[PDB]
């Protein structure tokens, strides 16, 4: 029971630009506050240990300062890899809220591929089709599926990727599933996707005859 | 070189225990403290408790009654036992450490183990090979479309791990109770066929480890 308020929550900011994050105890502590940085899927990480010392290993650009109650931590020069969720702490059961550092780079277009179900999972009864939308910036995009040429809504899931640690890209995939019998009573399958780099879509197409 | 060592049971039905052990080397458990630290998905850290060298433990007070953490010095293994799970205990754990004079920050930390509470049944995925249909092009994107599976988490390598730049695992998706994802991978045209590709699928609850070599239709 200290409170250690962070702010702000999200960072979108352009590689090589500099970052601040604030925390705010709710009490005096000294230099008592630490760093920890936390990457997708990966465990916490020390950067900043007593208010202002780097750890071992840690960069020149990842500072902190402040004693009492105004705690600051900074990235002088962002890079590309620092995408992560940053968080105080004070004593050990004391966190910040976190605050999710996102790469803002150049608008760029997806590359698509389709693929169409394996004979495996035909056997097991399932055909799962495969659009995948890779490497482009910002994240939202649009994917429409038509079969025989008629747009199918119906079995379809989307799932996107982490932004990337080195390009700063999204990638994405659109999987239509249907039963073997239902993709076997049709032979075009398209899908069109849509971003905001164009108002023209990229299309993908095959025909399950062919395949 | 330090490493904390966290294992568990991947799933936990309601109302029931969980027991982890975090395995220690590089330092004396008799020596340092070892805390106990959990994230809900999508949540930042909550710690639960410490057990210090000498065997004083002292515990978050929101767990009340709710925990126990012991250990054995002569195996190095660190223990969390916390009963009455419910649906919100579903987390990554980790245990964590502290090697040096750094003031409260824990320097050393496991990889975690990931806990699901829930009255569904463990269930190894299906991996299906995702192979161009029917190409030119400078470079060829393969991949790996991982589905039925419950719980989280899968993980996906490319070679065993020795292809790693331009792979893309996108995020995993539930549906009907059961998850499901894919992972892609880009590479030149020429070296595949030519070269073998396998995607390596794990599911640590089911003990999965799974290989799929993606063939030329």
């Known amino acids: 029971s200290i409170v250690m308020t962070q702010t702000p929550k999200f960072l979108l900011v352009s590689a090589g630009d500099r970052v601040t994050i604030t925390c705010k105890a709710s009490?005096?502590?000294?230099?008592?506050v630490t760093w920890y940085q936390q990457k997708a899927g990966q465990s916490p990480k020390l950067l900043i240990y007593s208010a202002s010392n780097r750890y071992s290993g840690v960069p020149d650009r990842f500072t902190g300062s402040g004693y009492g109650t105004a705690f600051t931590f900074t990235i002088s020069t962002v890079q590309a890899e620092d995408l992560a969720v940053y968080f105080c702490?004070?004593?050990?059961?004391?966190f910040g809220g976190g605050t999710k550092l996102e790469i803002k780079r150049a608008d760029a277009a997806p590359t698509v591929s389709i693929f169409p179900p394996s004979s495996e999972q035909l056997t097991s009864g399932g055909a799962s089709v495969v659009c995948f939308l890779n490497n482009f910036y910002p994240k939202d995009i649009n994917v429409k599926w038509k079969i025989d040429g008629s747009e199918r809504q119906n079995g379809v899931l989307n799932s996107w990727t982490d932004q990337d640690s080195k390009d700063s890209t999204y990638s994405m995939s659109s999987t239509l599933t249907l039963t073997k019998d239902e993709y076997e009573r049709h032979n075009s399958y398209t899908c069109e996707a849509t971003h905001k780099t164009s108002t023209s879509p990229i299309v993908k197409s095959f025909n399950r005859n062919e395949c | 070189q330090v490493q904390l060592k966290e294992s568990g049971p991947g799933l936990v039905a309601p109302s029931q225990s969980l027991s982890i052990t975090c395995t220690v080397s590089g330092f004396s458990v008799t020596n340092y403290g070892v805390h106990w630290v959990r994230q809900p998905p999508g949540k930042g850290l909550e710690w639960l408790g410490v057990?210090?060298?000498?065997?004083?433990?002292n515990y978050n007070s929101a767990f009340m009654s709710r925990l126990s953490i012991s250990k054995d010095n002569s195996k190095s293994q660190v223990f969390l036992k916390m009963n009455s799970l419910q649906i919100d205990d579903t987390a990554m754990y980790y245990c964590?450490?502290?090697?040096?004079?750094?003031?409260?920050?824990?320097?050393?930390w496991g990889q975690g183990t990931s806990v699901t509470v829930s009255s569904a049944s463990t269930k190894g995925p299906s991996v299906y090979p995702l192979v161009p249909g029917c190409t030119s092009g400078s470079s060829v994107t393969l991949g790996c479309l991982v589905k039925g599976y419950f719980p989280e988490p899968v993980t996906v390598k490319w070679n065993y791990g020795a292809l790693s730049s331009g792979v893309r695992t996108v995020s995993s998706v539930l549906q009907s109770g059961f998850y499901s994802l894919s992972s892609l991978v880009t590479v030149p045209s020429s070296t595949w066929p030519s070269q073998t590709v396998i995607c390596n699928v794990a599911h640590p609850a089911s003990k999965t480890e799974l290989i799929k070599r993606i063939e030329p239709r």
């Open positions: 964590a450490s502290r090697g040096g004079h750094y003031g409260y920050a824990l320097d050393y």
């Open positions: 009490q005096s502590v000294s230099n008592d």
């Open positions: 702490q004070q004593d050990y059961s004391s």
């Open positions: 057990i210090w060298a000498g065997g004083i433990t």
